[PDB]
Amino acid sequence: GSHMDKTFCVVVQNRIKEGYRRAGFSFHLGDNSLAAVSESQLAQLKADPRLVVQITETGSQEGGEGLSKEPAGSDEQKQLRADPPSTDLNTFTVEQLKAQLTERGITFKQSATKAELIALFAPADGEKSEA
């Protein structure tokens, strides 16, 4: 096979959805195999705290790794950390937007029919925020 090198094919078994995306390969809901690379694969797949990355070396029962912990260790910033709020735009029905836009200084006669004025209200005042 190979020697004097650390090349392995890795696969990410995910059970999220068919739209979680990734680096840019339209990662679907399932397992994707990785080509035999030095180590970038592992770090690239592990760098993303969403999917899983496991190395499978068919021909080496050495190691085992006695490291169970990893997520924890010197906590500095977290704040709850469990489930995304997702409670911001929801509070905006239809009559609020139209009443808030005008009261906010954003008239709407031609545009902002109903689907535009309800979507308009987005928390991104600055340059390019992602809330």
From Swiss-Prot:
Give the domain of life. Answer: Bacteria
The secretion signal range is none
Instruction: Give this protein's Gene Ontology molecular function annotations.
Output: DNA binding
Q: Where are the transmembrane segments?
A: none
Query: Which Pfam families does the record cross-reference, listed alphabetically?
Result: FluMu_N, HeH
Q: Which InterPro entries match?
A: FluMu_N (IPR041227), HeH/LEM_domain (IPR025856), Rho_N_sf (IPR036269), SAP_dom_sf (IPR036361)
The family assignment reads: To phage Mu protein gp35.
Subunit note: Monomer.
Q: What is this protein called?
A: Mu-like prophage FluMu protein gp35
Give the species. Answer: Haemophilus influenzae (strain ATCC 51907 / DSM 11121 / KW20 / Rd)
